[PDB]
Amino acid sequence: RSPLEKASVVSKLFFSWTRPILRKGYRQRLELSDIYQIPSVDSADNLSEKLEREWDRELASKKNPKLINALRRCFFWRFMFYGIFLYLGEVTKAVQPLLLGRIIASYDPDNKEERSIAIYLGIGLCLLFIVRTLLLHPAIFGLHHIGMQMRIAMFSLIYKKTLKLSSRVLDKISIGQLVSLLSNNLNKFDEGLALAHFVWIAPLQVALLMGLIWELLQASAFCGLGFLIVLALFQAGLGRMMMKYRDQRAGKISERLVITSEMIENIQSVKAYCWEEAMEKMIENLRQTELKLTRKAAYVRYFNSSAFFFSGFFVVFLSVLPYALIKGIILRKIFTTISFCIVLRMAVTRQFPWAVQTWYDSLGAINKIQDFLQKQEYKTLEYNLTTTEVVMENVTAFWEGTPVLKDINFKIERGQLLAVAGSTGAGKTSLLMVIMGELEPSEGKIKHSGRISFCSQFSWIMPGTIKENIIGVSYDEYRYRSVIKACQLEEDISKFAEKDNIVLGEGGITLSGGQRARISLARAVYKDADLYLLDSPFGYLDVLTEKEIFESCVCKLMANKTRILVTSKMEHLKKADKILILHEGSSYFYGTFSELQNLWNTYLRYITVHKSLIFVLIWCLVIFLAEVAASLVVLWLLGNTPSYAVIITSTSSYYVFYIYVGVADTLLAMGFFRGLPLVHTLITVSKILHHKMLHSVLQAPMSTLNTLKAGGILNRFSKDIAILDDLLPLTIFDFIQLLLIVIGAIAVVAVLQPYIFVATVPVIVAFIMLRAYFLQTSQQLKQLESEGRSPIFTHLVTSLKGLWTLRAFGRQPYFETLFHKALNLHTANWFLYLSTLRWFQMRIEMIFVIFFIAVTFISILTTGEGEGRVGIILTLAMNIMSTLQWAVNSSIDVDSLMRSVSRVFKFIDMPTEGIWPSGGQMTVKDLTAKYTEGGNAILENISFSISPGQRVGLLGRTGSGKSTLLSAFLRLLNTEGEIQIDGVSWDSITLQQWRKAFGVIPQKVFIFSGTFRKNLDPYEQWSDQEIWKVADEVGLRSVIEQFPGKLDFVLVDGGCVLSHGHKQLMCLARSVLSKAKILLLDQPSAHLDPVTYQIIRRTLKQAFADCTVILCEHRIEAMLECQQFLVIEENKVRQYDSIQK
Ligand SMILES: Cc1nn(C)cc1S(=O)(=O)NC(=O)c1ccc(-n2ccc(OCC(C)(C)C(F)(F)F)n2)nc1N1C[C@@H](C)CC1(C)C
Ligand SMILES: Nc1ncnc2c1ncn2[C@@H]1O[C@H](COP(=O)(O)OP(=O)(O)OP(=O)(O)O)[C@@H](O)[C@H]1O
Ligand SMILES: Nc1ncnc2c1ncn2[C@@H]1O[C@H](COP(=O)(O)OP(=O)(O)OP(=O)(O)O)[C@@H](O)[C@H]1O
Ligand SMILES: CC(C)CCC[C@@H](C)[C@H]1CC[C@H]2[C@@H]3CC=C4C[C@@H](O)CC[C@]4(C)[C@H]3CC[C@]12C
Ligand SMILES: [Mg+2]
Ligand SMILES: [Mg+2]
Structure with a gap:
């Protein structure tokens, strides 16, 4: 069934089996009707069963339990099998300048050997391209496939351990940490495995290239090598700096996220308390501290990244200079040593440091998982046969x-x-x-x-x-x-x-x-x-x-x-x-009882949100034109200037353009006067967007927020904001740098010779028309893939709240089955996305190769008795397109990341919200309430009045709208009608004043993880002596003195230390500070003890003696202080009088 396994050998090599989805998704929207079934190899059951069979042996047969040992018993010999082909493909790239360099020299009539044999070089070079095309891409895709299996095998193994954690382990730390443990390698593992082999391939490449350079520069090759050793040491030192700043700020992100979740879950209380402004400043300070280390890490990553570009001249000149001074060097070897050093710089400055950093992260993740896998387990041994008589x-x-x-x-x-x-x-x-x-x-x-x-x-x-x-x-x-x-x-x-x-x-x-x-x-x-x-x-x-x-x-x-x-x-x-x-x-x-009686336009908005990024981008462009203008004049001065160290002849002068293109990346590299401002300005854009989004959420109608998923709100502040802090600032910089080099290199060589620009038109158009075709399908699969991860995390969350019920009845196999089904859905979309991306990046190289074969044979054949202008023009053009192929693939990542920017922007565009109390007599007329737009009508045409200062009882059957009426008073849901308080109509004053007059006491009191004084008043309106005065009546004195600090104790985890009654008192005192007039209680008497129960009785009769209280109880025995009674039934409110009825 799976098309991959049904594919033939030749089609599987070229990824041709991705044809049906690309055509299907190009002209219509895709859905879960043509998403192919996952292969049998990577099903969650088969992977988890295999790995656990090896891991459990490692902790029982060997002395020291290590997860890394068991992993290599499953995925090592397939890992090395793809490493040999990856190495053989890179060696092919190192030996290209031998075949290509002689062809370029063959245009000079002063050469004899190259003229005698050029057809043989052309045939061999063509085979060299074809072999390399079909040797790298399968190997890289194979490593991605194994990295996917490792990720799935470990996630399924983690979930099985989670179901067995002891009760005493869960009470310390879980849920919030457990989900974060799975969201650090969601995509960095599989894609971050194809370059792990470069830790040993790169040393093997340097030895090979240094031998080839020894032929050209007899003993000065080592002078340039020593510069690359210093760069490797310099880059290594930045690695320790980057990791230090990354791991130092890990605790700040968790502190922000956990506090943000508290605000989101209790958003209804935050609106009722009028605490919008305070919470924005509370998070703002946390972001300000985090951003300090975020910028430091970005500066370090800038200098580490911008070393490839700024080494293309210092490695060549340092090794050509000693040779040129000893004896006269000809232009041909200057270009040849440049061609070799291009590969040499990539291997040692771009591939090796990336490989080492990955091993630091791969091993760190495995050791982090290993420790979690050996926590205390729930004991399953229990009595079986007892005749069902517990004693x-x-x-x-x-x-x-x-x-x-x-x-x-x-x-x-x-x-x-x-x-x-x-x-x-x-x-x-x-x-x-x-x-x-x-x-x-x-x-x-x-x-x-x-x-x-x-x-x-x-x-x-x-x-x-x-x-x-x-x-x-x-x-x-x-x-x-x-x-x-x-x-x-x-x-x-x-x-x-x-x-x-x-x-x-x-x-x-x-x-x-x-x-x-x-x-x-x-x-x-x-x-x-x-x-x-x-x-x-x-x-x-x-x-x-x-x-x-x-x-x-x-x-x-x-x-x-x-x-x-x-x-x-x-x-x-x-x-x-x-x-x-x-x-x-x-x-x-x-x-017994008997014996008891006696005892597009998104890019435009992303840039201009700051109004300071405009000036930096202009500054980068203006300097870019200045360097281009200098490059043009200097090449034109050498175009007419009349033996020195450099032996240049009339028939070999065309090498000037080849040399310039080979070093144009260095001449047009963004220095620290342009890169640092650009990186700095891109980061503060993320800060600005976060502030607007955080401001928009706290000021949005409640109906809009109820239409969204439970955990969806926090996911934007967790994943999307984090992407804007790390990925975009550097990916955009890298994309701009490559694009700027191509424009600069192609605009300088084309003005002197107005034919290179024409000959390179087909290559540019081909790369663009292919990109527009692939992106239609790629974006659709990415959206499906990203949405497939939420059900996975939801299953993990819900299986922890009910964990005690699961283990009691013995239903772990059922939940393991459910978790595996969730993974297979995510695997199906990810695998298709990974295959089509490999299709695009393989065809983009195949388009380059087919033009190269066309150019090479024309250039050789057109070269007649002397020179040949067609050969010089065409071959140089294809050297420019080598960088464009790199730049086009870099643009895919930018487009993928801008989907996150679009998701951030739509949260900002949400709609906004819509002594005065003399006695406290409210009048309600024709009130209609509904939670969602067009859903239903819980209450219809409500009409009643309240005498000022009376205690109004509220009764009714559960699920009738008892709590809906209390929310409708604050209009925390879509309502129509008129509610007047002492004559002032519902819409004669701004909403902020209206809500300030209600002392609501919810069932779940909102207490965030902060200082005791901060919870009483985040706005910091009242002094200590004023807070103590209020605490004197509500009985909070002895409550707070139990803790070591007075008004300085740091509550954590929703105030877990404080009992239910103590939180009721804290909520009650909070309304006294703000001087509420109309109280709204909601079923406080669930499991209360008389110790605290009697304190509320006094306060409602001493401090709020003259204030109206809506006592919402479930029994008449408690309701012995009320005069008026409201009863809710069949969508109707009816007032009543004294108990005689
Ligand atoms: C149709 C179809 N549509 N879709 C969605 C998939 C398919 S396909 O898989 O059947 N074919 C193609 O995907 C396909 C196969 C090969 C080629 N080649 C281009 C040069 C080239 O080199 C040949 C050469 C012998 C030199 C060697 F091979 F050595 F390089 N080959 N181009 C192909 N494409 C057709 C278009 C859909 C897009 C485009 C231009 C990339
Ligand atoms: N997971 C836990 N970790 C630590 N202490 C706990 C835990 N669960 C309960 N306790 C403590 O054990 C004691 C009794 O717990 P508690 O649930 O069991 O009693 P209870 O009478 O059922 O309370 P209530 O009726 O209010 O729910 C208390 O001191 C409580 O703080
Ligand atoms: N957030 C919500 N969105 C949509 N409908 C809701 C929401 N909360 C409650 N409802 C619906 O409103 C009706 C009554 O809800 P509920 O608060 O109002 O009654 P209650 O009498 O206050 O509850 P109880 O006495 O059990 O605490 C039910 O049909 C319920 O499904
Ligand atoms: C084992 C791997 C890394 C490949 C082999 C590396 C070494 C042994 C290779 C790489 C390039 C090779 C050199 C390439 C060119 C020449 C010039 C020739 O006139 C004498 C041999 C000499 C000097 C070769 C000696 C061996 C050499 C230095
Ligand atoms: Mg209720
Ligand atoms: Mg209990």
């Missing part, structure tokens, strides 16, 4: 100076229900950890059963269909329909737009809090297990639905299976068989 006795455990649980025991017969209770932080969840084997007890003795179904408190939602999130692997209509219509999903499912096949994102951002709880609960009960562990599923569910689910699912469906339920509700305990209460990590009570 514990004298069990102790630690999460590290205090035991988490001590001497806890129970005994559950099959079909019983155990109710676990306690307080916040008592270890309810940690008790379930030991039962799954996630936390091996230090000195305990516990019995494990078979498959165990775990329902974590954290809601897990994975990409795909709603039913696909429930059924798992096997489907069953009768079972599915019963589970769906037992968890009260009947109504909500057949509501949205598409019944049940709705496609969800990672984490289910578009779903209600309680709807996600039911889906996670429904998945746990669907699958058959020996025992079920329900870790507090009723957190988000209101009382009315809580009873219905408890009576129809927990007590009805699984009435005859052992089940452990964690719950604090008093009524749920009496319906259980045995109860276990944890006081503080220790069993205070154990027993």
